[PDB]
Enzyme design. Sequence first.
Site, PDB file in Angstrom:
ATOM      1  N   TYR A 137      -5.549 -17.342   7.813  1.00 13.47           N
ATOM      2  CA  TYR A 137      -4.491 -16.290   8.054  1.00 13.47           C
ATOM      3  C   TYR A 137      -4.174 -16.449   9.558  1.00 13.47           C
ATOM      4  CZ  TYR A 137      -3.469 -14.468   3.277  1.00 13.47           C
ATOM      5  OH  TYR A 137      -3.168 -14.178   1.922  1.00 13.47           O
ATOM      6  N   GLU A 197       3.554 -10.461   3.450  1.00 13.62           N
ATOM      7  CA  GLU A 197       2.529 -10.667   4.593  1.00 13.62           C
ATOM      8  C   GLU A 197       3.175 -10.858   6.098  1.00 13.62           C
ATOM      9  OE1 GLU A 197      -0.036 -13.817   3.058  1.00 13.62           O
ATOM     10  OE2 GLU A 197      -1.261 -12.388   2.053  1.00 13.62           O
ATOM     11  N   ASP A 207      -9.847  -8.899  -5.586  1.00 18.01           N
ATOM     12  CA  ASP A 207      -9.365  -8.564  -4.296  1.00 18.01           C
ATOM     13  C   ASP A 207      -8.985  -7.395  -4.129  1.00 18.01           C
ATOM     14  OD1 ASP A 207      -9.739 -11.408  -3.726  1.00 18.01           O
ATOM     15  OD2 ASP A 207      -8.069 -11.463  -2.376  1.00 18.01           O
ATOM     16  N   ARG A 217      -5.917 -25.404   4.066  1.00 19.53           N
ATOM     17  CA  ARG A 217      -6.113 -24.412   5.072  1.00 19.53           C
ATOM     18  C   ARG A 217      -6.813 -24.946   6.073  1.00 19.53           C
ATOM     19  NH1 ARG A 217      -5.701 -18.293   2.168  1.00 19.53           N
ATOM     20  NH2 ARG A 217      -3.635 -18.844   1.389  1.00 19.53           N
ATOM     21  N   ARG A 238       5.981 -14.833   4.743  1.00 22.33           N
ATOM     22  CA  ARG A 238       5.432 -15.908   3.929  1.00 22.33           C
ATOM     23  C   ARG A 238       6.178 -15.811   2.528  1.00 22.33           C
ATOM     24  NH1 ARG A 238      -0.652 -15.803   1.532  1.00 22.33           N
ATOM     25  NH2 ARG A 238      -0.441 -17.113  -0.719  1.00 22.33           N
TER      26      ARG A 238
END
Lengths: 385, 385, 385, 385
Positions: free
Chosen positions: C320, C196, C69, C286, C211
Amino acid sequence: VILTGNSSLCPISGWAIYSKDNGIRIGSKGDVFVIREPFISCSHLECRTFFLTQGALLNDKHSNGTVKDRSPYRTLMSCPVGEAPSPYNSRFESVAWSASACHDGMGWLTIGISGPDNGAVAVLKYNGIITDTIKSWRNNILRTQESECACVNGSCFTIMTDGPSNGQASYKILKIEKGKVTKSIELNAPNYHYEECSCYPDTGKVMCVCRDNWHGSNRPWVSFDQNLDYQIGYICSGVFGDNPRPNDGTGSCGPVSSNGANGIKGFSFRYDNGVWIGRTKSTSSRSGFEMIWDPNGWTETDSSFSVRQDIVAITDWSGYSGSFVQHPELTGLDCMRPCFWVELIRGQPKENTIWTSGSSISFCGVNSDTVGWSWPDGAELPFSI
Amino acid sequence: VILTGNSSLCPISGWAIYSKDNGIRIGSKGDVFVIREPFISCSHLECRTFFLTQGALLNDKHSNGTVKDRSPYRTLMSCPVGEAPSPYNSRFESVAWSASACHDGMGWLTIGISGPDNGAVAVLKYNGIITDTIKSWRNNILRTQESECACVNGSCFTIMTDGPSNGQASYKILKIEKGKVTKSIELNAPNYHYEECSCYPDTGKVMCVCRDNWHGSNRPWVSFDQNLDYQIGYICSGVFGDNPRPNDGTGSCGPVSSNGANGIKGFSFRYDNGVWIGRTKSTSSRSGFEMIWDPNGWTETDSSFSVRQDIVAITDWSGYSGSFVQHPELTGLDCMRPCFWVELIRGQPKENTIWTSGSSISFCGVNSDTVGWSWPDGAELPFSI
Amino acid sequence: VILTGNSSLCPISGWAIYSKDNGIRIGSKGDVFVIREPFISCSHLECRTFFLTQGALLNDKHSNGTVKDRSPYRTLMSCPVGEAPSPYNSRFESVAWSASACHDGMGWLTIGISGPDNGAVAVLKYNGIITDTIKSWRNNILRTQESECACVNGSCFTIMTDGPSNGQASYKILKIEKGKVTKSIELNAPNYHYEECSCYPDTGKVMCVCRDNWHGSNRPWVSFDQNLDYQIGYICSGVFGDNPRPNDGTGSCGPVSSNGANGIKGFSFRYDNGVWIGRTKSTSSRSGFEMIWDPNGWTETDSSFSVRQDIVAITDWSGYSGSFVQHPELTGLDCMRPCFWVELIRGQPKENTIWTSGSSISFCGVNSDTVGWSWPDGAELPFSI
Amino acid sequence: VILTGNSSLCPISGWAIYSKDNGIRIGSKGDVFVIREPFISCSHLECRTFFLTQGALLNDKHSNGTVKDRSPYRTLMSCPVGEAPSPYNSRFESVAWSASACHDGMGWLTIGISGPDNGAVAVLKYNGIITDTIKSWRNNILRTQESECACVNGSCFTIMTDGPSNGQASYKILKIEKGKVTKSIELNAPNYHYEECSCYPDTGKVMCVCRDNWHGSNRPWVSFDQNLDYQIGYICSGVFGDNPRPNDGTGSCGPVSSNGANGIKGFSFRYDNGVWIGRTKSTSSRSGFEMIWDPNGWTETDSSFSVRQDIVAITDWSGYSGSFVQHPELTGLDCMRPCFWVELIRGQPKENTIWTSGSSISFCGVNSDTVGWSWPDGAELPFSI
Ligand SMILES: *[C@@H]1O[C@H](CO)[C@@H](O[C@@H]2O[C@H](CO)[C@@H](O[C@H]3O[C@H](CO)[C@@H](O)[C@H](O[C@H]4O[C@H](CO)[C@@H](O)[C@H](O)[C@@H]4O)[C@@H]3O)[C@H](O)[C@H]2NC(C)=O)[C@H](O)[C@H]1NC(C)=O
Ligand SMILES: *[C@@H]1O[C@H](CO)[C@@H](O[C@@H]2O[C@H](CO)[C@@H](O[C@H]3O[C@H](CO)[C@@H](O)[C@H](O[C@H]4O[C@H](CO)[C@@H](O)[C@H](O)[C@@H]4O)[C@@H]3O)[C@H](O)[C@H]2NC(C)=O)[C@H](O)[C@H]1NC(C)=O
Ligand SMILES: *[C@@H]1O[C@H](CO)[C@@H](O)[C@H](O)[C@H]1NC(C)=O
Ligand SMILES: *[C@@H]1O[C@H](CO)[C@@H](O)[C@H](O)[C@H]1NC(C)=O
Ligand SMILES: [Ca+2]
Ligand SMILES: [Ca+2]
Ligand SMILES: [Ca+2]
Ligand SMILES: [Ca+2]
Ligand SMILES: [Ca+2]
Ligand SMILES: [Ca+2]
Ligand SMILES: [Ca+2]
Ligand SMILES: [Ca+2]
Ligand SMILES: [Ca+2]
């Protein structure tokens, strides 16, 4: 700003390269239109390449050239100079299988002819809005320059032809103001043939150098003032300008009949009694390109000339060519700058592809050092489809 | 607004990353030009990446790199900083196999050299309009910076070389105003060799740090004022800047002969008697990149330095690099900001592809915290074609 | 115009759909970046989608997700709202594997963090020019919002975290003026965890909802004035906002430990003691998305709520989400309009592709009739590569 | 500048071709959206093509047309007139499976309806910012024009239908000011059916000509002033305008029941008691297109007419059509210029592809010479996917 068009052509010694789009090389992989007649025209701000497409891309089945030239799919589009012509960078201008465009200092005039052979209609737009139409008067393929119209003092000028491409036809000069035809006159020109004129402004008047497809291997010309008071002739030089043509020899101030049938769109620039002639290198094939300065070539028939500058080698394909100018309002100069473009035609009939397209190169006249070279298309044919 | 160019270089401690275009990774799938020399240059409003393409795309047969470097297909184009160079986002600038560009506060100057080896011509454009030409004076590959020219007080400045790449050649400083050469001078530089200069403005003058391809593994430099009153030398540091080069050792204020033949375009920034040197990490291969601060390295010959900041790991390919600045008119600072770009070359000769292309990264000098890392190209070679 | 940021949130009854980009469906054929965190931010003139890419396209080998990432290839880019993110329509912003951006009324601030895990550096730009840097102070993955920073009265505000993602870390509020950090403060927040953050301006102050990846299944918040005088807490509602989370039950004004580890970027809007919570529909996956109005949910711990509006069905993937606002200067309203975006994540780890990407949808709060529905990604996976 | 809308329709004799996008031919190779309803609308500065896409491209699996018309993927986008609709040249407007847009002289109004059949919501945007919503009042597919709304004196106007497509439904006129509904009225129209209205401004009022899907093979119309004082009727001409329809015969000023069920979006322009009708050439299939001038056809029931101009041959597919105007503010004329577009539908149900898309052509009314021809789609189906 309206462009005055009153300056005279700049003194020049040769031609400096201005653009090369590599359209066909890029189109081997990218999404690039199959095009013809990539003519340049400029405003007071920028220059654009106009072109006709069959609304089809390279490396696609729709590029199949067997589509008639005069199809309902053909459109006039434009893109910035030197960029490959793509649906992602190209502005739509007009539905057209024959076209012209030019800017008057305030807005773009585009002329796009579509419709049937027996009743074609020219749609004129100014700033993209329809402002006039002109219908075929001889019912036999109304057609126009395939290069930029000429603008002087807020009026723009073009030439249209209607009638046979292999015999006497009818030729008209149009005066257009903000996209409206305000005057026209038919040329009294028996035994002349005018197609695909390349017209530029010079000292408040316009000069057009054209293609005689009937019986001339030298180029006809027509010049006129803002009132459309005109003169006509052929370029006298024995340095013959058309393709096909004979070997250089004794010229004529009328149509040179030897190898006179057929032709190619081209241009020339008059300087006094002299002429800059752009032409193919081959007398028989659309191959090579060169600029020739013949200091007495406008009015005198000898085959002598003083300067040759190579543009495309005879071993590479060329094609249509045309004039464009850059006005003082754009350049800051005190004179009218001459430029030209050349279309580098690839594919049919000379090459074994399903399609025919051109890429382009262009040059501007300068009074500073230059050099001859070859700047050919460069694509390796065939492609995948 | 003309850029004054009267400010001195900003105090800096390190280099903050400014851009990364991932051109080659993107071009694995997208329509991306094969390019070289992705040099950045800025106006008072924005920064652009300029580059040379052979007018061919990655993953296509026309990318075949057996084509001469000096081809009639090569063009100078530009795109916004940090974007993959595509036919869909790139502006055409000039036909060119060697180039420079810079902005004077009012318009872009572009310089593109094309034509044959024995008679190349640089075409200068200002705001896209041809303004001058400069023809080869030694008939042996007229060539220029491959990075931005430098502008000060309404004039812009560059260096051109003509002559052998493996022996004594001829070097000229050009002063250009609105695209027109207004002054030039030849360097009296026996036993020096200048190619591929990276030139920046500093305190009303210009400094160029270049590539000696003949017999120096340190870099030659030339500095001059607006009158072209010049000084010449080589960077004295035993931290050698060229590639190839020897291991660090005792430097010289003239050309260091060990591993001196051949080279790579690069740059350095002079601060007082100190220097920031950008260089490959490898002494033999175009691999890695690093910035070295040598506080006495402009004038002293020791191999001691005080700071190293890693830019690309030695295990990854690098390539050409050059300076660019951001003027106060752009940044709002009261000093001239130094930046640099690095070309990350992939393909031939080191890798088994038909093509050679570069992607790019760039950094700006800041007086705030920074970090060393590796930001390499990242493409997985070969592709499909 | 500097945005005043003094208005209070608009009265609303529900959420009207603002955009949907279909990025992944289009990317099945077109040239579209693999992206994550497609956050929206607006100026006084327009709205843009910012995103991070690995500099790789869908349907290409470089999309292989096994790339870390935090790679040197990752960049922050932006495109117009609702358009597929392509190299042909996307602006480069910063080299970044974690990011924020926001506009102050005069120019864009972008924050892009790159560099190694033990010494990452945030590069701040204003109008694309580097204006500051901030280096890691705990040497453990300096990281930021992944959504828009908040601007009030010419200063912009963000939150950065440095330290473990599974235990106590360090959290700072930054005040940034024209891209320069002018103030910061570290949160005295033992037992809290902030990552975040989704931060918006409201009545001259800023509220951030974040978060907790350590041990909270409700969301932490931090609010502060222009002096960085702050308050901290967790959302009290038993309508739990994180993913994963427990079934709704009794909340806490501190971290709810049940299912507290791990999390998802999200947001909420405070209205008095009430709260609009956006959340996934699943407590474990999610999946799905819904907006819930809990009129006492900011300060009270019951699991009662009054309105649910469906956004994405539980049978479709979400991801997200974040806040963005539209200021009076943009809308002409007398209040601050709340909006949100949702990332619809496709591919790994839930699906069998080599890549992971998101598309996006967004909604704006209105006081007029609305409707619940499902607006999922819609792509059919896998693709070709 | 607000558009006054006080001028009357320009005197015209025929239709000049304005654009042709060749979208489907281009999309054989390029990245082009699958679209429907490519309606044109203009500001005081430019004209755009608006369209609905399922957020999928031609030659891709996501183009599979088994997707519901009313999908959460459908979006209203726009691109410049005459360009293939691509993700690289198209602006996002709204999430929508039914839509309208128009410009008031100051900004664009867009209306996009999404959400479930039993509760759809129209989202209104002015300059891209949400300004209002209108929810379904009969819970049965709230729907609108699929062509431009009409603007007069700073207000814009449209028609929405809610209820059965095969029986009596409910019809409302909406008056919108800067994106906000300021007035509405339901038509008292028993035994009428209005869908897919084509509405234009004329002399300070608005005229809409629509589609009766229930039981009329002539077209219903509604006209109204700025106060929404309205009149209703059907076009009386026995030159029937819908598709399907009977052969021409005796018309009615109410709904003509023969072949009345089903229909196609279309338009007509009223001049005094006369009418220009655009219609398919086939009475049974969406094939061909033609413009008919019936000098008494608004109010008289005979099947006599005076002019037919061919637009698309009966042997080629046509599709939806709609009106658009160019206001004096755009054109510089002293009258309102009528134009129309035609969608050329390819693929399912008539052709063996997985997809259904349209390309477009458009024409403007002129009082100068014109010609009939055929300008069909021209794609060769099927493609590869
Ligand atoms: C580029 O365009 C060209 C022109 O459109 C194409 O060339 C044409 O190809 C077609 C094939 O569809 C061919 O058609 C006829 O070929 C024979 C005549 O000599 C004849 O035997 C064929 O008749 C048979 O097939 C048809 C089905 O299409 C049936 O209707 C008949 O009953 C029978 O079974 C057929 O009519 C043309 O000859 C040919 N045109 C010419 C004159 O060259 C190219 O194919 C195209 N190029 C590419 C690469 O796509
Ligand atoms: C997406 O990225 C993934 C990570 O980069 C790729 O997965 C990796 O694939 C490679 C194949 O290059 C694989 O490498 C090793 O596989 C074995 C270890 O279990 C081992 O037998 C291999 O060793 C042999 O081959 C190499 C040549 O590369 C030689 O050096 C050796 O001498 C020997 O001959 C090899 O080292 C990885 O296991 C694997 N990574 C993991 C951990 O999953 C994917 O391939 C890529 N996806 C796609 C579709 O491209
Ligand atoms: C590249 O070009 C050279 C010379 O034209 C040729 O020898 C070689 O085969 C070409 N490579 C490919 C893969 O086409
Ligand atoms: C298109 O979609 C339908 C329903 O999902 C399916 O039955 C059909 O197989 C699909 N067609 C193709 C070619 O994928
Ligand atoms: Ca001839
Ligand atoms: Ca002569
Ligand atoms: Ca492609
Ligand atoms: Ca060297
Ligand atoms: Ca030293
Ligand atoms: Ca958590
Ligand atoms: Ca509650
Ligand atoms: Ca009907
Ligand atoms: Ca009648």
